[PDB]
């Protein structure tokens, strides 16, 4: 092997490896000079192939290009020399947005309307940035958004190497859901991924926020999903969700990609709506 790179390189002895987070491990980074920062550390299994290294490296290099933003999982450093590759990224202690929301359901301290609307604003900001840095996510969902101790939304997995011409549509998320339910049609049937298809996925993310971790199309298998999509079926409006916000998800789910709003626009509308939401 790996080229050295002093902009990012951290000494192996400056990193105290702790509990597995699920390999991604929690760690402590001394310096970054006599203070420690909790960080998460991406690494490879023993199992691993040369393609897996290739992928971790790509991911890290992408993170290098895209630069920093409050609302993405930032790269903090890396251990690349005389040992296993460690990619050091920001740690987000309260898990993925899906879990964080589900846990705050009524029977923990519940979330206000303002909080839910504020969640969506932060993800729409993270997305605007990624978009402006020419990056297309392809799997935007609540699960790939994380929450820090301070309740800050952080888009994760945005640098990921994934050969789209090899997606297993029948494969389930670790929690039992099917990724295809976040995919814009044209991505799904035609494999055309744009900022526009991400916006479709933001639509479903909004739905998740406002049903507090709801599952899109429950018990709807793949073949039936395609039918719902081809028929132009749109999900029902969540309760405790406003028409204006329901219009937004609908607008994100416009059939014609060019007519969907952009993230720049969404960030403006969310800014306006957070301010007026109780």
Q: Is 77 annotated as a binding residue?
A: no
Q: Could you give the string, one character per residue 68-87, with x where binding to ligand 0S7 holds by CB under 6 A and - elsewhere? A: -----x--------------
Q: Which one of a second copy, ligand 0S7, none interacts with residue 225, CB within 5 to 8 A by kind? A: a second copy
Q: Is 98 annotated as a binding residue?
A: no
Which among ligand 0S7, a second copy, none contacts residue 21 (Cβ within 5 to 8 A by kind)? ligand 0S7
Instruction: Indicate the residue among 90 and 128 with the shorter CB distance to ligand 0S7.
Output: 90
> Cβ(91)–Cβ(28) under 8 Å?
no
Residue of the chain from 28, 61, 115, 157 that contacts ligand 0S7 (CB under 6 A): 157
Cβ-contact 72, 59 below 8 angstroms:
no
In the bound state with a second copy, the residue whose beta carbon lies nearer, of 44 and 220, is 220
What residues line the site for a second copy (CB under 8 A)?
A: 211, 214, 217-221, 224-225, 227-228, 233, 236-239, 241, 246
- Indicate the residue among 95 and 185 with the shorter CB distance to ligand 0S7: 95
21 annotated to a ligand binding site: yes
Question: Burial of 86 by CB count in 10 Å (0-12 exposed, 13-18 middle, 19+ buried)?
Answer: buried
- Torsion over CA: 254, 255, 258, 263 (sign): positive
Is 115 catalytic? The answer is: no
DSSP H/E element including 16: strand 15-20
CB of residue 57 to ligand 0S7, shortest distance in Å: 15
Note whether 93 binds ligand 0S7 by CB under 6 A. Answer: yes
Nearer to a second copy, 194 or 215 (CB): 215
The dihedrals phi and psi of 263, each to the nearest 5 degrees, come to -70, -30
What's the number of CA atoms in the CB half-sphere (13 Å) around residue 101?
A: 27
219 binds, among a second copy, ligand 0S7, none (CB under 5 to 8 A by kind): a second copy
How far, in Å, CA of 134 to CA of 67, rounded? 12
Rg, C-alpha atoms of the chain:
19
CB 95 within 8 Å of CB 22: no
Q: Looking at 21-29, 56-64, 190-198, 204-212, which segment touches ligand 0S7 (CB under 6 A)? A: 21-29
Report the C-alpha gap between 115 and 130 in whole angstroms.
Answer: 23
Among 97, 146, 205, 266, binds ligand 0S7 (CB under 6 A): 146
Query: Which of 40, 28, 34 is CA-nearest to residue 73?
Result: 40
CA 205, CA 216: separation in Å to the nearest integer?
10
Residue 278: CB partners within 8 Å, gap ≥ 6? 112, 113, 114
Residue, CB closest to ligand 0S7: 22
**Minimum CB–partner distance for residue 18 and ligand 0S7 (Å):** 12
- Residue ranges of the binding site for ATP: 21-22, 42, 90-92, 96, 143, 157
- State the catalytic residues: 139
Interface positions with ligand 0S7 (CB under 6 A): 21-22, 24, 40, 73, 89-93, 95-96, 144, 146, 156-157
């Amino acid at each position: 092997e790996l080229p050295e790179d002093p902009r990012w390189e951290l000494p192996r002895d400056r990193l105290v490896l702790g509990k597995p987070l699920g390999q991604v491990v929690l760690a402590e980074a001394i310096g970054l000079p006599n203070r420690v920062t909790k960080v998460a550390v991406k690494m490879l299994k023993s199992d691993a192939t040369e393609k897996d290294l290739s992928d971790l490296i790509s991911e890290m290099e992408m993170m290098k290009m895209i630069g920093k933003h409050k609302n993405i999982i930032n790269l903090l450093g890396a251990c690349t020399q005389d040992g296993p590759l460690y990619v050091i990224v920001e740690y987000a202690s309260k898990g993925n947005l899906r879990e964080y929301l589900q846990a705050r359901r009524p029977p923990e301290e519940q979330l206000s309307s303002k909080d839910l609307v504020s969640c969506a604003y932060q993800v729409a900001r993270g997305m605007e940035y990624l978009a402006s840095k020419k990056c297309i996510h392809r799997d935007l969902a609540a699960r790939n958004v994380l929450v820090t101790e301070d309740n800050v939304m952080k888009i994760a997995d945005f640098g990921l190497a994934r050969d789209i011409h090899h997606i297993d549509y029948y494969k389930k998320t670790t929690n039992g859901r099917l990724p295809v339910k976040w995919m814009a049609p044209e991505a799904l049937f035609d494999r055309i991924y744009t900022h526009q298809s991400d916006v479709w996925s933001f639509g479903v993310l909004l739905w998740e926020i406002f049903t507090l971790g709801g599952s899109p199309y429950p018990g709807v298998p793949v073949e039936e999903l395609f039918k719902l999509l081809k028929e132009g079926h749109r999900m029902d409006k969540p309760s405790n969700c406003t028409n204006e916000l329901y219009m937004m998800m609908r607008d994100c789910w416009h059939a014609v990609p060019s007519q969907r709003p952009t993230f720049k626009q969404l960030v403006e509308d969310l800014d306006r709506i957070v301010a007026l939401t109780s």
